[PDB]
Amino acid sequence: ASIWVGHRGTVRDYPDFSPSVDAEAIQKAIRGIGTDEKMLISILTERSNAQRQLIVKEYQAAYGKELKDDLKGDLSGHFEHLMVALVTPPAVFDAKQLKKSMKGAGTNEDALIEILTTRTSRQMKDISQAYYTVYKKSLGDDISSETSGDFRKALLTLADGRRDESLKVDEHLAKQDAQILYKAGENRWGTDEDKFTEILCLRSFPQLKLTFDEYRNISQKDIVDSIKGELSGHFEDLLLAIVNCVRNTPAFLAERLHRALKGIGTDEFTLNRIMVSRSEIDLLDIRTEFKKHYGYSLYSAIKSDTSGDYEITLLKICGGDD
Ligand SMILES: [Ca+2]
Ligand SMILES: [Ca+2]
Ligand SMILES: [Ca+2]
Ligand SMILES: [Ca+2]
Ligand SMILES: [Ca+2]
Structure with missing residues (x-):
């Protein structure tokens, strides 16, 4: 299956x-x-x-x-x-969503970040294959042409789907990597961004969770505070998204749904992408986190900012109230 x-x-x-x-x-x-x-x-x-x-x-x-x-x-x-x-098809939809995020003069770094950080390694391999099939250009090449610097390097690392798939957690490796993160950022002038990228993009989520725990013991602060004081721009956003997804993917996506539903105007592209792409994966957990964090259900949130046929379809996908 x-x-x-x-x-x-x-x-x-x-x-x-x-x-x-x-x-x-x-x-x-x-x-x-x-x-x-x-x-x-x-x-x-x-x-x-x-x-x-x-x-x-x-x-x-x-x-x-x-x-x-x-x-x-x-x-x-x-x-x-x-x-x-x-x-x-799901792989095709993500591919189309990735291509849409890099078309025209603009570039939607937020969508790029959301997709590349929440898809598993096997999913990314599928997306890369579909992208190549449908657009006849590799995902890496298009990502490369629309981004620059450390953000570009970290996205290309993620687009390869080489994040360790193992189910093992190694206490020893976690402590070693926590020490390398500390030396790469807090402990030196400047930052060894490549090291941040290598550890945060290639270790498994469970491994990283352990690493963040060890990082806090060595540094007296959370990895999030170091990322914020060491980096900036889209590279910083990318790394914070990884940390957030390592701790709770559904809560990260719930936050993304929350931001798309309020403010200046509704972000239908994000709403559609998350509702559809997570409907058969974890929308139920997204709904739980959304209510835990905001105090109202995703269902009532959709009811207050959308209307018509569009609203009914999203409410049906949502599947219920919390
Ligand atoms: Ca573009
Ligand atoms: Ca530093
Ligand atoms: Ca540097
Ligand atoms: Ca910053
Ligand atoms: Ca007709």
Whole structure:
């Protein structure tokens, strides 16, 4: 079973699923004038991504059309994006999200940071393969052309998916690395950024947790305070994201959802990416952390800043109140 499915998702396989039944219902809802969005919503948000792909294969066969194109020609705005995101294979969606983050004059460093720090090593290998297949350029090369300095080096390190996959924790290595981090930053003039990058990007999460514990004992401070006093810019943000994900990935993503839902305006691109990409992995834990940290559920948060068909689809993905 797939590397894209976790133990705490809000979207699961539908036992009574029938691809020909669903494809026929979707074709009816989008064909002719008017669209039955409640129908598209009731089906697609109640099928896992694996089943949706079966709907996709069954729709191209029977109607000679790609469901993605039917959805895009009929739907609009944020609802359209969210609906198209649901029927995209997970590796392909992250690849498209990575490419979107580096297009035009701007560059969305925050999205780059979010994706490269939360995907496991096996997921990154998949994303790199899909990116290469769909864009015919390596992910490393595009990352390289849109970034510079230490941030660039750390992103390229992450894009390779070589973070240690072992399940072992070595007390001895943790103490040694804590000492190297201290010498690389606090203990010298300047900083050996390469060392920060090498340890924080290649040791396993459980190993790093131990390392941060040892770091605190040696330095009398948290690794976060050293990163803040030693580094700056996007490189600093990247390293803090790694530390936050090492301690609690769902809380980091909950914070990202929180920031996308308030302020100057709603960040629908981030909301869509997190809701869809974590729906079959850990959205349930994201919901728990969101409520623990903010005092209100993700569900009520979505209800207060979104509306219409877009709001219903996100509430259905959310799967419940906390
Ligand atoms: Ca129509
Ligand atoms: Ca760009
Ligand atoms: Ca220093
Ligand atoms: Ca330096
Ligand atoms: Ca700083």
